[PDB]
Every structure is written in structure tokens, then in C-alpha cells.
Amino acid sequence: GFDLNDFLEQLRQMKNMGGXXXXXXXXXXXXXXXXXXXXXXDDKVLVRMEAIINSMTMKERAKPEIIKGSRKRRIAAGCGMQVQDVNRLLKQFDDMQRMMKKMKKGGXXXXXXXXXXXXXXXXXXX
Amino acid sequence: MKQSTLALLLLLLLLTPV
Amino acid sequence: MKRTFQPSVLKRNRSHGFRARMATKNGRQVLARRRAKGRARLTVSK
Amino acid sequence: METIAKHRHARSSAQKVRLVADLIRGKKVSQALDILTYTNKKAAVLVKKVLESAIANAEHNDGADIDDLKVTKIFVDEGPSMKRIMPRAKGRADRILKRTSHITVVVSDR
Amino acid sequence: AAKIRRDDEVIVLTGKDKGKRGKVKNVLSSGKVIVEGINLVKKHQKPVPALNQPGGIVEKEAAIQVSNVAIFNAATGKADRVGFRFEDGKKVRFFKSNSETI
Amino acid sequence: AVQQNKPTRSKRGMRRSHDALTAVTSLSVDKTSGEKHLRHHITADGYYRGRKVIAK
RNA sequence: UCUGUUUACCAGGUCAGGUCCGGAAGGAAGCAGCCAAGGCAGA
RNA sequence: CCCGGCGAGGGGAGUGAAAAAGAACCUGAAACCGUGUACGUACAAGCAGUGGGAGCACGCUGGCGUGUGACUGCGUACC
RNA sequence: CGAAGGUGUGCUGUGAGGCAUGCUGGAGGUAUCAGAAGUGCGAAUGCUGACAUAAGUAACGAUAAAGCGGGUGAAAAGCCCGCUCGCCGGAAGACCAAGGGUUCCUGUCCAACGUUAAUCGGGGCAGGGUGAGUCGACCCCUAAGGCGAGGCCGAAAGGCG
Ligand SMILES: [Mg+2]
Ligand SMILES: [Mg+2]
Ligand SMILES: [Mg+2]
Ligand SMILES: [Mg+2]
Ligand SMILES: [Mg+2]
Ligand SMILES: [Mg+2]
Ligand SMILES: [Mg+2]
Ligand SMILES: [Mg+2]
Ligand SMILES: [Mg+2]
Ligand SMILES: [Mg+2]
Ligand SMILES: [Mg+2]
Ligand SMILES: [Mg+2]
Ligand SMILES: [Mg+2]
Ligand SMILES: [Mg+2]
Ligand SMILES: [Mg+2]
Ligand SMILES: [Mg+2]
Ligand SMILES: [Mg+2]
Ligand SMILES: [Mg+2]
Ligand SMILES: [Mg+2]
Ligand SMILES: [Mg+2]
Ligand SMILES: [Mg+2]
Ligand SMILES: [Mg+2]
Ligand SMILES: [Mg+2]
Ligand SMILES: [Mg+2]
Ligand SMILES: [Mg+2]
Ligand SMILES: [Mg+2]
Ligand SMILES: [Mg+2]
Ligand SMILES: [Mg+2]
Ligand SMILES: [Mg+2]
Ligand SMILES: [Mg+2]
Ligand SMILES: [Mg+2]
Ligand SMILES: [Mg+2]
Ligand SMILES: [Mg+2]
Ligand SMILES: [Mg+2]
Ligand SMILES: [Mg+2]
Ligand SMILES: [Mg+2]
Ligand SMILES: [Mg+2]
Ligand SMILES: [Mg+2]
Ligand SMILES: [Mg+2]
Ligand SMILES: [Mg+2]
Ligand SMILES: [Mg+2]
Ligand SMILES: [Mg+2]
Ligand SMILES: [Mg+2]
Ligand SMILES: [Mg+2]
Ligand SMILES: [Mg+2]
Ligand SMILES: [Mg+2]
Ligand SMILES: [Mg+2]
Ligand SMILES: [Mg+2]
Ligand SMILES: [Mg+2]
Ligand SMILES: [Mg+2]
Ligand SMILES: [Mg+2]
Ligand SMILES: [Mg+2]
Ligand SMILES: [Mg+2]
Ligand SMILES: [Mg+2]
Ligand SMILES: [Mg+2]
Numbered sequence A: 001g002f003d004l005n006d007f008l009e010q011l012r013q014m015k016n017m018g019g020x021x022x023x024x025x026x027x028x029x030x031x032x033x034x035x036x037x038x039x040x041x042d043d044k045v046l047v048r049m050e051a052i053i054n055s056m057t058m059k060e061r062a063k064p065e066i067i068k069g070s071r072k073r074r075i076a077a078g079c080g081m082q083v084q085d086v087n088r089l090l091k092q093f094d095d096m097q098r099m100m101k102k103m104k105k106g107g108x109x110x111x112x113x114x115x116x117x118x119x120x121x122x123x124x125x126x
Numbered sequence B: 001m002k003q004s005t006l007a008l009l010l011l012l013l014l015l016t017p018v
Numbered sequence C: 001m002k003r004t005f006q007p008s009v010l011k012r013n014r015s016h017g018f019r020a021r022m023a024t025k026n027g028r029q030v031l032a033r034r035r036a037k038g039r040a041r042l043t044v045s046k
Numbered sequence D: 001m002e003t004i005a006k007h008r009h010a011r012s013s014a015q016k017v018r019l020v021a022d023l024i025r026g027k028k029v030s031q032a033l034d035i036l037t038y039t040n041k042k043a044a045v046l047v048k049k050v051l052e053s054a055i056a057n058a059e060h061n062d063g064a065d066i067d068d069l070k071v072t073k074i075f076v077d078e079g080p081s082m083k084r085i086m087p088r089a090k091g092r093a094d095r096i097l098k099r100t101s102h103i104t105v106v107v108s109d110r
Numbered sequence E: 001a002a003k004i005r006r007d008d009e010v011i012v013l014t015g016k017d018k019g020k021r022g023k024v025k026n027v028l029s030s031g032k033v034i035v036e037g038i039n040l041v042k043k044h045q046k047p048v049p050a051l052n053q054p055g056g057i058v059e060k061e062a063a064i065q066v067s068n069v070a071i072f073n074a075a076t077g078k079a080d081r082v083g084f085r086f087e088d089g090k091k092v093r094f095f096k097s098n099s100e101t102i
Numbered sequence F: 001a002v003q004q005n006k007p008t009r010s011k012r013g014m015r016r017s018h019d020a021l022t023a024v025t026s027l028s029v030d031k032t033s034g035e036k037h038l039r040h041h042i043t044a045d046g047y048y049r050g051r052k053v054i055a056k
Numbered sequence G: 001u002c003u004g005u006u007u008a009c010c011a012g013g014u015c016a017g018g019u020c021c022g023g024a025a026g027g028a029a030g031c032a033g034c035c036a037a038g039g040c041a042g043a
Numbered sequence H: 001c002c003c004g005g006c007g008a009g010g011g012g013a014g015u016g017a018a019a020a021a022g023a024a025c026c027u028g029a030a031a032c033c034g035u036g037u038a039c040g041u042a043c044a045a046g047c048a049g050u051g052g053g054a055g056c057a058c059g060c061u062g063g064c065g066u067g068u069g070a071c072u073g074c075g076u077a078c079c
Numbered sequence I: 001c002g003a004a005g006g007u008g009u010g011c012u013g014u015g016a017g018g019c020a021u022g023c024u025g026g027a028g029g030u031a032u033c034a035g036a037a038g039u040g041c042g043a044a045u046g047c048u049g050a051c052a053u054a055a056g057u058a059a060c061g062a063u064a065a066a067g068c069g070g071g072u073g074a075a076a077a078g079c080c081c082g083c084u085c086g087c088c089g090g091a092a093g094a095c096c097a098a099g100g101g102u103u104c105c106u107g108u109c110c111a112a113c114g115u116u117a118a119u120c121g122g123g124g125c126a127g128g129g130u131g132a133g134u135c136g137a138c139c140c141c142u143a144a145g146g147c148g149a150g151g152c153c154g155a156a157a158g159g160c161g
Helices: A004-017 A042-054 A069-078 A082-105 A109-112 B004-015 C009-016 C023-038 D014-021 D031-040 D044-063 F010-017
Strands: D002-011 D070-078 D081-086 D095-098 D100-108 E009-012 E020-026 E032-035 E039-047 E055-062 E069-073 E082-087 E090-095
Touching: A004 A042, A004 A082, A004 B004, A042 A082, A069 A082, A082 B004, A109 B004, B004 D081, C009 E082, D002 D044, D014 D044, D014 D100, D031 D044, D031 D070, D044 D100, E009 E032, E069 E090
Parallel strands: none
Antiparallel strands: D002 D100, D070 D100, D081 D095, E009 E020, E009 E069, E020 E032, E039 E055, E082 E090
């Protein structure tokens, strides 16, 4: 299936090619609903991302749900960073694992057609 | 291609708005 | 078994429907009492 | 040093959960985890989750060692009960209590 | 007929910030004002990736009652009280102690 | 047929004396996997009396 | 005692990546991978 | 930040004079239901108390308070 | 420098009571002498609310019936997929009117609802879906019957036509 080794590969392949002005322009469908400026700083987020993924042992990378409080302490200590960044990175891998399972079960055109952008009420951003 | 662009788009992109 | 209320819209309306109340003196008095008691709906319509 | 955990509003009677919660009163938390594991009950599961939780609390919040712990206080109170209605023969309706319960576990090293 | 208005320099009469001085940022219809550097609250925010806000404890200025602030007369160096008079055809504000126009 | 007077909490306690569970005392530790488990039941890993009898 | 393989952080060494100090020179704590090493085995 | 199911529920941190003010939110009584501690109870018959009364526990400074109440006299709720 | 209330304890009166103080509580109380009462609760098969009891008992709604492998998943007797098995078959199938009103389909969610569990649903939230010259209504026409210009009838309203 999908692992943080496969996310390691997706990430050292994506930190090579990627930019935030070539990625926020290839879509004008979610550059109208979300602010055109909310992309990221790609170099920093993918260098932190590759740092945090590299700090992992091979059994924590191949199986991402065995990572708990002590392991996040240690991933924060080896890459010299915050337990909160490690947290929200295990959370983005959680969502993209969710989405590659939803591309796996349903066809590429049914999981690209039923994808939804939302407003809590129809007024802009509110 | 098809799964390269559907990976890459929803990945960088849905990394962004959530 | 066969219970009392067997619904039919037509019957419902020709009987207690608004115009059927606008038929008679006592219809119009029921409507008065109803507005005076500040009823949400006077008759059954829709 | 005491460390607490509470599950509040668990669906179970107080009375059904007590039956389980009594097996582990006083034990060394290891042994407790096991007794709960091979106990066949729903309350078994509730109580166990609360217990493990309390141990996590002790260790992360208070830095207390898991091997030293005992279960010093454990008790179950009667939470807010949601009323319902079960309809009966001859049209007499009968109000139902779906009971909740408050499971409190308190562990300490000493 | 608003005694305290935007951009005035006020002094805080009451509360933790009593004695302090500052410039009025805006007023709310509740008879409340928001003063600069005054009445600072530490507010926790849950990070919004839609608004590109991080989370955290961020210090913001809280609404304070307008009964609790006085127009500051820098002339007398004290808290003052406003009154309205008619100069030209225009209603204007003046101080009650030395009786001169704001 | 229904009770004439309210049975007291004392009574109600007495009746429930016997409804106490019995703890499971014996935890068998396997030779190979060193897992605890009920006697005569296979482990979580499908180990029994030294063997892996179930790959599961 | 050779070889087969196992053991996240909280025994050791190398410590990539990344991160701290410095304008720069360079250091530094150290996660992973590897080797000790500790489990379990072929002899 | 930590357990948990990307829960419910919790425990930390922080805000605040106060979080036994946490949105199931002021005060939080009684019935009711528990956990801990003291004494009592498995040869004993009844409106369960009252008169007496050992022993034990706990407070005091060898005496007094409090809790309990083995045993015995009398004793068939209120309206 | 801690009111009302709440809750212990101590003292005091012949009683209904009073006084003092520990904790709780966090802003109101009120002497004295008068005045006026929605002025005192255990009963009324009293009223409303709350919580006991029987009891963790009776019951889980047709005796058509299940079993196994695999999937997902925190967890699978119930979900999905496969192989069997069993039931209806003038219905327990298919298509409408009546009535309902979104229950339809897709994602998504598991607190409450489902007499159990639930990853499932006619449950929750979001989106999507209903295409007519010839189908039906609307319309053309009358039945029973209704309403009824004038008109007759009637204290009044109204009755008949
Ligand atoms: Mg009908
Ligand atoms: Mg009925
Ligand atoms: Mg009788
Ligand atoms: Mg029993
Ligand atoms: Mg929470
Ligand atoms: Mg503070
Ligand atoms: Mg307080
Ligand atoms: Mg409550
Ligand atoms: Mg207040
Ligand atoms: Mg309260
Ligand atoms: Mg209370
Ligand atoms: Mg109470
Ligand atoms: Mg004898
Ligand atoms: Mg005896
Ligand atoms: Mg007897
Ligand atoms: Mg006596
Ligand atoms: Mg003593
Ligand atoms: Mg004494
Ligand atoms: Mg006696
Ligand atoms: Mg006698
Ligand atoms: Mg007082
Ligand atoms: Mg009063
Ligand atoms: Mg008081
Ligand atoms: Mg006090
Ligand atoms: Mg008081
Ligand atoms: Mg207080
Ligand atoms: Mg007075
Ligand atoms: Mg008074
Ligand atoms: Mg008087
Ligand atoms: Mg009265
Ligand atoms: Mg009486
Ligand atoms: Mg009765
Ligand atoms: Mg109420
Ligand atoms: Mg019961
Ligand atoms: Mg029985
Ligand atoms: Mg029986
Ligand atoms: Mg029956
Ligand atoms: Mg039965
Ligand atoms: Mg059934
Ligand atoms: Mg199966
Ligand atoms: Mg569940
Ligand atoms: Mg299965
Ligand atoms: Mg079945
Ligand atoms: Mg099947
Ligand atoms: Mg047949
Ligand atoms: Mg219809
Ligand atoms: Mg609906
Ligand atoms: Mg459906
Ligand atoms: Mg259920
Ligand atoms: Mg669905
Ligand atoms: Mg639905
Ligand atoms: Mg036709
Ligand atoms: Mg006709
Ligand atoms: Mg006429
Ligand atoms: Mg007529």
C-alpha cells in the first residue's frame, strides 16, 4: 500500500521539482475559493519534511501508526525541531494516505470528480 | 501523466488549504 | 385493523379548506376566533 | 503522587461496570491490564481504556514509573440518564432509562 | 455628541491599566473603546491554514468601557471633562477645567 | 404477583453478593513468543505450546 | 569463538539528511543507515 | 503537549481574582448511588426504638467528650 | 477585614426558636418598635419535577436458516465481495392510482435514532437528481350534488330555487 517510505520518495521527488508560483497557478478552481497566497514556502517545508522523514527508523517509516509520544520526542530531537511540526507532518501524511486510499478504491476520475471545496455559510470566507 | 498529475496536484494543493 | 383516518386531500380541502370556511357565517367566525388566538395556520392548505 | 483519569458519560449502568472495576481494585497495574484483557465484558473495555490512559497521564505529566504503580482508587458513579419511550401492548407507553456512568480511576506509585 | 472620538489621546481612569495614556483606535456602539497599548489580552488561536495564520498566544487589545476613560488634556497634564459649545455655526468640544476648544 | 413493601438497600445488596465476577488467575506464558494467554487457547500471534500453528 | 539473522528514544563509535553558535573560519547535540553490542539460532 | 478511533472522554499547559466559573457553565439543598476509615454482625426471632449497659476505636488533660452498641428491662407505625 | 443561602459544631429558652462560630459562598442583609399578610404542610387514589423499587429480572416483534473464505476497519455473527445453503414465486416479484414529501443517488460521519454490535441504514452533514405538441393534470362536456343574478320565503342571521 502507502507508507512514509513511499512518502519519503514522493517527498525527495517533490522537493526537486516543486515551487509554490508553478503549483498555485496550474489551478484557478481552488485559487478563487482559498486565498491565492496560502500555498507555502516550498523549500523550507520540504527541507523540514525530508529532515523529519529521514530522522525516522525504517520500521517507523514503513509503519507510521507506531509513532507515539516518545517517538515524536525523538524525531523532534534528531532533526532539531518542534514536536508540533512532527505532529502536523504525521497529520499531512495521514490526509494524503487517506487520499491515496481514496484514489486506490475509487477510480482516478470518480475521486477527482467528487472532491469538494466548502463554505460554513455561502457568504465569502464565513 | 494521469496519476503523476493527479498525485502532484492534489498533493501540493490539498497540502495547502486544509 | 381499518382505523378511522383514511387520508384524501380532496375531501380534506372541500371539508375544512379555507374557501369552505369562507362559505358560511360560522366559517367566517371560526376564522375570526383563529386570527384572534393568533394561530399559525388557520385552515389546512398545503 | 496521584494521577487521575475519568471517562464520563459512558453508556453502561453504574452497576454493570462496578462488577468489573472491582476485580482490579488494589492490583499492580500490569496484572490489572491482563485481568481486564481476558475478562469478557463491555465494561471490561471501557475500564481498560481509562486505566491505560491514567498510566499515560502518570508517565508523561508526572514522570512516574509505570512498574511502581498500583490502582489506589477506582469507582463508578451514576451519570445523567437519557429518558426514552418504549411503546407497549394496549397503547400504554413505558418510559426507559438509558443509563450512563462515570468511571474514575486514580493511580499512584505509593 | 460623542464625547470621546476616534484618535483622541485618553487616559484610563480605572482598572489594571489605570493611570495609563494612549491613542484611541476605534469605538464600538456598546459604549466601548479600543485603546492602543492598553488592556492587552493574551488570546489563544487555533491555526487557520485558510487565513495563513499560525496559532499561538497572541496579544490583542480588548474592549474597555468608555466611562473608564477620560479625554486627556495635555495642557493641564490631567484627565479632563468634555462639554459642547457653539462656535461659528459648528458644535465643538472643549475642556471643563481651562475651558478651551479641543 | 408483585412486592408488597419496598425491599431495602440492605436486602438488595445481599442478593448481589454472589453476582461478583471471578478474576482470571492463570496466565500461561508461552515458551517461544513469551506471550501471556489463557491456558489451552492460542496466543494473539497464533502460537501454541511452542509452535506457530496459525500464520495469522 | 566464525556464519545466519534480530534490538525505535532513553548502552557505544561513525554519524548522511536536517538543526543550534559564527559575517567567515569552522565547530556542536545528534535522529536514520552501517559496525560493535545485547536477543535467538547453524557449528 | 499526552492516552484514545484524525473519537467521545479525560489529564497537563495557558487565560482569569477564581476553571470545585469550561460553555452538560452562579449559588448547588434532599431523596438516590458509590469509595475510604472506626465499631458492630454468620445459634439468631417481631413497628428496629427507648432505659440500662460491657468491650473497642478516637479525641482530650488517671478523669471527660465523640463514634460504635455484644447483652438485658419495657415496647403491635402515623393519619 | 466576606452579606443572603448552603453545611457542621458549640451555647441558650417551657416551646414555636434564638445567639455564636469552622468550612462553603461571593453581594447583599437588617436591629428596635410599629403595620400588612399569597405567613408556617406529611397525608387530600393532591399537582409539577427528580430519583428509587421489583431487577440487571421479563423481553429484543412471526420456527423462511444459515455456513465458510477474502475485504475494509479501533474493533466484523449483522457491512461489502465470492462459493455454497434455505425461503417467496397469483408474491414475500414487476408497474401505477391514493397518501407521503426527498425517504432517491453519491461522498462523508457514528454522539443520539436502529430493541444488540455497526465500518451499515429509510439515522447526521454536504453535494447531486425529477427534461414531454402525443403520459397525467390543466382545458372542452355534463352525473349525483353544490353555489345561485333576479324571485318566492322567513323575529334577525337565514331557508328554498
Ligand atoms: Mg382513502
Ligand atoms: Mg397501537
Ligand atoms: Mg396491605
Ligand atoms: Mg442474581
Ligand atoms: Mg478533547
Ligand atoms: Mg495565573
Ligand atoms: Mg470559589
Ligand atoms: Mg449536572
Ligand atoms: Mg455575580
Ligand atoms: Mg455549577
Ligand atoms: Mg455536590
Ligand atoms: Mg449531596
Ligand atoms: Mg440448640
Ligand atoms: Mg454470635
Ligand atoms: Mg428475623
Ligand atoms: Mg443510654
Ligand atoms: Mg491520639
Ligand atoms: Mg473517653
Ligand atoms: Mg435493647
Ligand atoms: Mg417486650
Ligand atoms: Mg455571618
Ligand atoms: Mg430577603
Ligand atoms: Mg449563613
Ligand atoms: Mg469563611
Ligand atoms: Mg455564612
Ligand atoms: Mg471564594
Ligand atoms: Mg424593615
Ligand atoms: Mg432574616
Ligand atoms: Mg408583626
Ligand atoms: Mg398558603
Ligand atoms: Mg395532618
Ligand atoms: Mg398508585
Ligand atoms: Mg427543570
Ligand atoms: Mg436494579
Ligand atoms: Mg425474579
Ligand atoms: Mg427467570
Ligand atoms: Mg411477554
Ligand atoms: Mg428470557
Ligand atoms: Mg427480529
Ligand atoms: Mg466472514
Ligand atoms: Mg463502537
Ligand atoms: Mg469476517
Ligand atoms: Mg443473522
Ligand atoms: Mg452474501
Ligand atoms: Mg419454495
Ligand atoms: Mg402524490
Ligand atoms: Mg432526511
Ligand atoms: Mg439508499
Ligand atoms: Mg446501537
Ligand atoms: Mg452511504
Ligand atoms: Mg440518509
Ligand atoms: Mg391523453
Ligand atoms: Mg344541476
Ligand atoms: Mg337574491
Ligand atoms: Mg340553493
